[PDB]
Design a protein around this ligand. Structure first.
Ligand SMILES: Nc1ccn([C@H]2C[C@H](O)[C@@H](COP(=O)(O)NP(=O)(O)OP(=O)(O)O)O2)c(=O)n1
Ligand SMILES: [Mg+2]
Ligand SMILES: [Mg+2]
Length: 430
DNA sequence: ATGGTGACGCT
DNA sequence: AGCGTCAC
């Protein structure tokens, strides 16, 4: 009791852009605003692969990974924006640049951890402590939280979404202990006021809307973020965790959406995150390893210690292309031409990175797939990256992979190559 | 024949 | 080092 850590020591937010690549295209092209629309890559094969989908198009059943020809069957008026193609491949520069817009804004508020192209964690603990000193025990108006949901409320003793949101917010604020600066719930609430300001800045300065979660750790903030997406933010308090977890499928928690989470379900015979509380730490460690068992034991109680890492920039800059089915690369000339395309895009991105960010990459990782292997990568080889030169990079890549070629005949490639990937890594200051 | 990414863990 | 998992 008096020695039981409750994992209420930090205020962490996760900001996640709404339908991000679609909003980038809608900002650019006003004709796509407030329409069913999707972003597609590669138009020739079944109208292109959908990679992002506006909320209006989601209502028709359009999803990511669908072919656009198929999505048009569900939504005949779907509008499409296509990813740029340069050097024979999809080029994601525009989305990378839009991501820097958002991340630079967020960084004004707090140090961020870039978790993906469209989301960042924020450790707001310090900012909250400072704002609590100005909010000199004065209560927090609902007007300061105009887009905030308090998960689990309203509860206890209006049939529209906004009415429910407000009732829940009022319950929460009416019970809050504003005179106590160390109250975790108070800290979260001030965290949420800060996130409202951050989200308004993002929208004002970019035109982009986003969702956010506010809780005491990354996993709860991420989970919270998705509860009321789009264009809303969600506060998940420590106290909300038992009910929230009681019906929360295990696969919804970050890192449990794959084989480990499946093994939790299978081995333990459970379905919901809350059901984990019934195992000892040692029991969990015995099935899932020391690190995972300890993490699960705490996480099912709403407790996690993973810090928000101070890192705004990607640690790797990579370029890849798949060559599926019959397009697989079967000649040495093909392999070299495409290694060069990749190397050229990579050179351009690396040169810009070095000018903007005062660093240089030092290692080149070369990864390939051969026809017939059913693993993402078949083979990964590193070499030194000593010059930002596409012909050098492409020549070196070829050098480190050429003995994969089981062909006797000189100019053929066997088995043919279904993927090429160049990744610049091991950055140093410059 | 979603594809083109990116972070991190294990041995 | 090279392989694997998990995810946006
Ligand atoms: N498999 C995936 C997942 C994401 N992305 C890109 C396109 C997305 O717009 C963007 C962000 O991913 P996301 O957050 O998973 N989804 P998105 O922002 O489109 O919609 P929301 O559900 O977040 O509103 O990354 C991708 O290209 N391939
Ligand atoms: Mg998003
Ligand atoms: Mg995201």
């Amino acid at each position: 009791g008096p020695h039981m850590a409750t994992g209420q020591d930090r205020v962490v937010a996760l900001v996640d852009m709404d339908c991000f690549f679609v909003q980038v295209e809608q900002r650019q092209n006003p004709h796509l605003r407030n329409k069913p629309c999707a972003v597609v890559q590669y138009k020739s094969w079944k109208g292109g692969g959908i990679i992002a989908v506006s909320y209006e198009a989601r209502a028709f059943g359009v999803t990511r990974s669908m072919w656009a020809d198929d999505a048009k069957k569900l939504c005949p008026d779907l509008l499409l924006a296509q990813v740029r193609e340069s050097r024979g491949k999809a080029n994601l520069t525009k989305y990378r640049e839009a991501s820097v817009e958002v991340m630079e804004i967020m960084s004004r508020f707090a140090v961020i951890e870039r978790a993906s192209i469209d989301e960042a964690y924020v450790d707001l603990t310090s900012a909250v402590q400072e704002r609590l000193q100005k909010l000199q025990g004065q209560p927090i108006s609902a007007d300061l939280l105009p887009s905030t949901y308090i998960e689990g409320l309203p509860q206890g003793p209006t049939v529209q979404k906004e009415g429910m949101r407000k009732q829940g917010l009022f319950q929460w604020l009416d019970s809050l202990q504003i005179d106590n600066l160390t109250s975790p719930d108070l800290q979260l609430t001030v965290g949420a006021v800060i996130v409202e300001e951050m989200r308004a800045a993002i929208e004002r300065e970019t035109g982009f809307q986003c969702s956010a979660g506010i809780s005491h750790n990354k996993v709860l903030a991420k989970l919270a973020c998705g509860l009321n997406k789009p264009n809303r933010q969600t506060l998940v308090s420590h106290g909300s965790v038992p009910q929230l977890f009681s019906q929360m499928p295990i696969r919804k928690i970050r890192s449990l959406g794959g084989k480990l989470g499946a093994s939790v379900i299978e081995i333990l015979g459970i379905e919901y995150m809350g059901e984990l509380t019934q195992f000892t730490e040692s029991q969990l460690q015995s099935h899932f390893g020391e690190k995972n068992g300890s993490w699960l034991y705490a996480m099912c109680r709403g407790i996690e210690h993973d810090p928000v890492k101070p890192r705004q920039l990607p640690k790797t800059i990579g370029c890849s292309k798949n060559f599926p089915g019959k397009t697989a690369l079967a000649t040495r000339e093909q392999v070299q031409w495409w290694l060069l395309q990749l190397a050229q895009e990579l050179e351009e991105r690396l040169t810009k990175d070095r000018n903007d960010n005062d660093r240089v990459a030092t290692q080149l990782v070369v990864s390939i797939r051969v026809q017939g292997d059913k693993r993402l990568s078949s083979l990964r080889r590193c070499c030194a990256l000593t010059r930002y030169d596409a012909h050098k990079m492409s020549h070196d890549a070829f050098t480190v992979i050429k003995n994969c070629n089981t062909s006797g005949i000189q100019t053929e490639w066997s088995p043919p190559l279904t993927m090429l990937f160049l990744c610049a890594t091991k950055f140093s200051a410059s």
